[PDB]
Coordinates of N, CA and C in Angstrom, one line a residue:
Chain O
X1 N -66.0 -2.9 -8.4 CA -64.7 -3.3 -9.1 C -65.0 -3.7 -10.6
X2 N -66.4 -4.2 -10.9 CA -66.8 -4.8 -12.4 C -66.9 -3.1 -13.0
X3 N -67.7 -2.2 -12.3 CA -68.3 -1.2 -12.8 C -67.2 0.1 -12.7
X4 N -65.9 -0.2 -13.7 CA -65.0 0.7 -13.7 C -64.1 0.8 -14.8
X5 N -63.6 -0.8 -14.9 CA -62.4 -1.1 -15.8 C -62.5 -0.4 -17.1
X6 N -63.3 0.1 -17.4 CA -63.5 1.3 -18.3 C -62.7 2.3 -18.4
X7 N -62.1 2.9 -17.8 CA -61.7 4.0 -17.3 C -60.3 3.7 -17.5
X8 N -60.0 2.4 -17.7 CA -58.4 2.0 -17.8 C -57.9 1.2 -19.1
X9 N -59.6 0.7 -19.9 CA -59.3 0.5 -21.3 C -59.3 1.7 -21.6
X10 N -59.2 2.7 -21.2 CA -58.9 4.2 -21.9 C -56.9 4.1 -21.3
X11 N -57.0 4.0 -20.6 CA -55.6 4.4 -19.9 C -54.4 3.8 -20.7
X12 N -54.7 1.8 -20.2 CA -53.6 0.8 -21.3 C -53.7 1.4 -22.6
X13 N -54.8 1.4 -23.4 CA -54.6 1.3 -24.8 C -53.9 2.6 -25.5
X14 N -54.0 3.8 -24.7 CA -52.8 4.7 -24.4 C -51.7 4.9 -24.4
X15 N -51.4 3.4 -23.7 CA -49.5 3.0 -23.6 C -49.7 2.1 -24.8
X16 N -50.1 1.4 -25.5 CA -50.5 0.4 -26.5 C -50.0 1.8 -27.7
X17 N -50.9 2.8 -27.9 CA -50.5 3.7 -29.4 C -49.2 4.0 -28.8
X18 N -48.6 4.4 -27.6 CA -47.2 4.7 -27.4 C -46.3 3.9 -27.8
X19 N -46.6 2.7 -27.6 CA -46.1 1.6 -28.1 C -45.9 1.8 -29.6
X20 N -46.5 2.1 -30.3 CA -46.9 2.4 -31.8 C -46.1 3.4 -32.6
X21 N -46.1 4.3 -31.6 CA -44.9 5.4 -31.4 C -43.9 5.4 -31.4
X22 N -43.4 4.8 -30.4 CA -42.0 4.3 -30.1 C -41.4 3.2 -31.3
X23 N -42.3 2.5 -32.2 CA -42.4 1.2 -33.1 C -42.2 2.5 -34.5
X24 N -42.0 3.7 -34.1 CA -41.1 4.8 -35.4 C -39.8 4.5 -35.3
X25 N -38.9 4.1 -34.2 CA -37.6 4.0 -33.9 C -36.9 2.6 -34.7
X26 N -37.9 1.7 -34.8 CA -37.2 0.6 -35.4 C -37.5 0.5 -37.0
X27 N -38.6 1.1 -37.3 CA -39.0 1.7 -38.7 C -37.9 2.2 -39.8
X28 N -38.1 3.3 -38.5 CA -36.7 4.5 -39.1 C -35.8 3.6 -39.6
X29 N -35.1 2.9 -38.3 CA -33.8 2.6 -38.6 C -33.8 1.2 -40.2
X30 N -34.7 0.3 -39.8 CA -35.0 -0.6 -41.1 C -35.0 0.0 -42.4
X31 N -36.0 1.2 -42.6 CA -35.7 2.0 -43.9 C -35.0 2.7 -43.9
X32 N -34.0 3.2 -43.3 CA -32.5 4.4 -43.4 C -31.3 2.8 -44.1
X33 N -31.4 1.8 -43.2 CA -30.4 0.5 -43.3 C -30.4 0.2 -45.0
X34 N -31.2 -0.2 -45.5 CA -32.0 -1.0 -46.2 C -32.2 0.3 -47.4
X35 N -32.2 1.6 -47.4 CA -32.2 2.8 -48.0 C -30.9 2.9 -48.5
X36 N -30.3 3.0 -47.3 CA -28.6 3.2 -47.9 C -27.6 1.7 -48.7
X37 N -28.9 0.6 -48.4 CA -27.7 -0.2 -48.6 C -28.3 -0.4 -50.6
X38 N -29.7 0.1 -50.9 CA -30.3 -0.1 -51.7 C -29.3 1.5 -53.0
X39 N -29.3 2.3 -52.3 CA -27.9 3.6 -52.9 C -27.0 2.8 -53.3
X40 N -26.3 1.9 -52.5 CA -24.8 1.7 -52.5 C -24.8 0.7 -53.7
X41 N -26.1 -0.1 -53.8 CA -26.4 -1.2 -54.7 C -26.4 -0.8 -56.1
X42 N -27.1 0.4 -56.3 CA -27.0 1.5 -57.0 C -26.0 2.0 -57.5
X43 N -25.1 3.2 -56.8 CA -24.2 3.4 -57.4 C -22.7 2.7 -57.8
X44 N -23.1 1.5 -56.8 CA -21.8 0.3 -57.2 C -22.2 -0.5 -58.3
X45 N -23.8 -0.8 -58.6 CA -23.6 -1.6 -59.6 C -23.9 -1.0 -60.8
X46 N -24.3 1.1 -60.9 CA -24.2 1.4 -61.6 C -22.5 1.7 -62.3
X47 N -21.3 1.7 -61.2 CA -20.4 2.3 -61.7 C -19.3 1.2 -61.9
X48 N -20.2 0.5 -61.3 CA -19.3 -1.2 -61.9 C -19.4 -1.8 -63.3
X49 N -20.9 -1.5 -63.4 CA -21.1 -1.8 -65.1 C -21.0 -1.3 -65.7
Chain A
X1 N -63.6 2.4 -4.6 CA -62.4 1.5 -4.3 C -62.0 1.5 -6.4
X2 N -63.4 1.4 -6.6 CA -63.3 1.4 -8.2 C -62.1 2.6 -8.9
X3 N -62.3 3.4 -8.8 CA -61.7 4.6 -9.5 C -60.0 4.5 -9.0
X4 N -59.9 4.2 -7.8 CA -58.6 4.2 -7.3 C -57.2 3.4 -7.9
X5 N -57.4 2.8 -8.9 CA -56.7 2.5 -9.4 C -56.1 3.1 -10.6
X6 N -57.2 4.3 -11.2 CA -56.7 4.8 -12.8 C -55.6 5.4 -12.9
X7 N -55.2 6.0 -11.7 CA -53.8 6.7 -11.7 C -52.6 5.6 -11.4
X8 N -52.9 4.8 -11.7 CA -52.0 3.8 -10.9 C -51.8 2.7 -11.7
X9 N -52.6 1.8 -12.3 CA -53.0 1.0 -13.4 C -51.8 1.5 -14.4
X10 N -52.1 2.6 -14.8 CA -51.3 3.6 -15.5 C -50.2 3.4 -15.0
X11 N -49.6 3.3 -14.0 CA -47.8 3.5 -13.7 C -47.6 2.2 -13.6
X12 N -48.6 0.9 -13.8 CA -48.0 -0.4 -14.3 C -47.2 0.5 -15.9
X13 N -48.2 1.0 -16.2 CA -48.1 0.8 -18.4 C -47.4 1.8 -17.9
X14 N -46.7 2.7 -17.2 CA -45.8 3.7 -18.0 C -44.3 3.4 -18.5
X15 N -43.7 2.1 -17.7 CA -42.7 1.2 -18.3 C -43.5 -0.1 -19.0
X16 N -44.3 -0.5 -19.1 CA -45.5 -1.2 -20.0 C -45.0 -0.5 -21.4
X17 N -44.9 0.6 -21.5 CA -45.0 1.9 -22.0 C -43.7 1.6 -22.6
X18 N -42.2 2.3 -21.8 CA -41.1 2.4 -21.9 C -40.1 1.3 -22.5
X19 N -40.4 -0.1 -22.2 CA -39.8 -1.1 -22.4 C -39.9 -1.4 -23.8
X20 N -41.0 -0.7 -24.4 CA -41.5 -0.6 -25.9 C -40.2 -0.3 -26.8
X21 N -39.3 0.9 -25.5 CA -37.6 1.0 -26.5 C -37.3 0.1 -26.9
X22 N -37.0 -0.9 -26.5 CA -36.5 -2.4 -26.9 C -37.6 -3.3 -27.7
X23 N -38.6 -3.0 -27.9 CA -39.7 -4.5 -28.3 C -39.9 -3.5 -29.7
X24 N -39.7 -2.0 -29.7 CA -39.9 -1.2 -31.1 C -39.3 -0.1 -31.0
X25 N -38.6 0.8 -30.3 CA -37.5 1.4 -30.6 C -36.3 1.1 -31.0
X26 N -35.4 0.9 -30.1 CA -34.1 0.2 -30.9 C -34.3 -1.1 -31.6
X27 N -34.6 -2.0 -31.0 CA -35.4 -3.5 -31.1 C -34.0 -4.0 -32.2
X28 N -32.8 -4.3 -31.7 CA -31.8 -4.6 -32.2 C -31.4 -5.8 -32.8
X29 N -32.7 -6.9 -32.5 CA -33.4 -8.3 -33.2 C -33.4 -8.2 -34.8
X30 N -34.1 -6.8 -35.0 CA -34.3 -6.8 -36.4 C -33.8 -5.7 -36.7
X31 N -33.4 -4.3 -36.0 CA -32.8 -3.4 -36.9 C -31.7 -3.7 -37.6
X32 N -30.8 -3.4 -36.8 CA -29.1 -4.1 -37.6 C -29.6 -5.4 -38.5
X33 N -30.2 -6.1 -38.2 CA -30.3 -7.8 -38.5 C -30.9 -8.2 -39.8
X34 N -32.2 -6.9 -40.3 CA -32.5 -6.8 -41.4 C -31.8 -5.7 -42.4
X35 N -30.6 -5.1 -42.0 CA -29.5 -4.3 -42.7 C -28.8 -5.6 -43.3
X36 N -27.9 -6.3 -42.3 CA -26.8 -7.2 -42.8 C -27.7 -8.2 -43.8
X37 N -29.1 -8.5 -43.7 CA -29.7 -9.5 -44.5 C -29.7 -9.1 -46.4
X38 N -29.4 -7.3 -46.0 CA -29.4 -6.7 -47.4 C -28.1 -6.3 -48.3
X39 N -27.2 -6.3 -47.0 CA -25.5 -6.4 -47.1 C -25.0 -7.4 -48.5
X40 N -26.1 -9.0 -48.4 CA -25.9 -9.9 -49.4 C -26.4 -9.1 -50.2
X41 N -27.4 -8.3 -50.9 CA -27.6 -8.4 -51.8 C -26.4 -7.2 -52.3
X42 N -25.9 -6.2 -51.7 CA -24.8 -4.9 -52.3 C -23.9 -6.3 -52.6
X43 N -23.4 -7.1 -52.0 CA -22.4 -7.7 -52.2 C -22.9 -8.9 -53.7
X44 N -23.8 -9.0 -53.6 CA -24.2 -10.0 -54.5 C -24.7 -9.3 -55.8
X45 N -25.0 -8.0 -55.9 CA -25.2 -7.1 -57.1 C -23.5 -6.9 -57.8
X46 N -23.0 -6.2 -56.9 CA -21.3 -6.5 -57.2 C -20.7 -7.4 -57.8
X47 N -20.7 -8.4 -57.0 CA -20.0 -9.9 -57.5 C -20.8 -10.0 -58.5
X48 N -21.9 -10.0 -58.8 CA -22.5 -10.6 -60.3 C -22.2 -9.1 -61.1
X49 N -21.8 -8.2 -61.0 CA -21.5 -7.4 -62.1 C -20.2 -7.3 -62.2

């Protein structure tokens, strides 16, 4: 049982970059939010001034 | 008895894995939450112009 757990720090750390992967979903949406709201800042405070 | 767990171990992490939608996929803590924190600034570009 000592002479194994090897085989499954392969396995977890697997789900761990998946993890990393999935961590594109909240990325995306931060810079699309934050993208558009940085446009709007933009073209409002270009066409305001 | 060692090996018999690697396929299995693994179906702890495959929602290990999944639940990652919420902790960094959608993760609705900070997506929306760091939008509306930028909302001040379109509004605060505005009002000061």
């Amino acid at each position: 049982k000592k002479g194994w757990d090897i085989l499954t720090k392969s396995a977890d750390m697997f789900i761990n970059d998946l993890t990393s992967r999935i961590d594109s979903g909240v990325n995306d949406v931060r810079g699309f939010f934050t993208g558009l709201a940085s446009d709007l800042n933009e073209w409002g405070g270009n066409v305001a001034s």
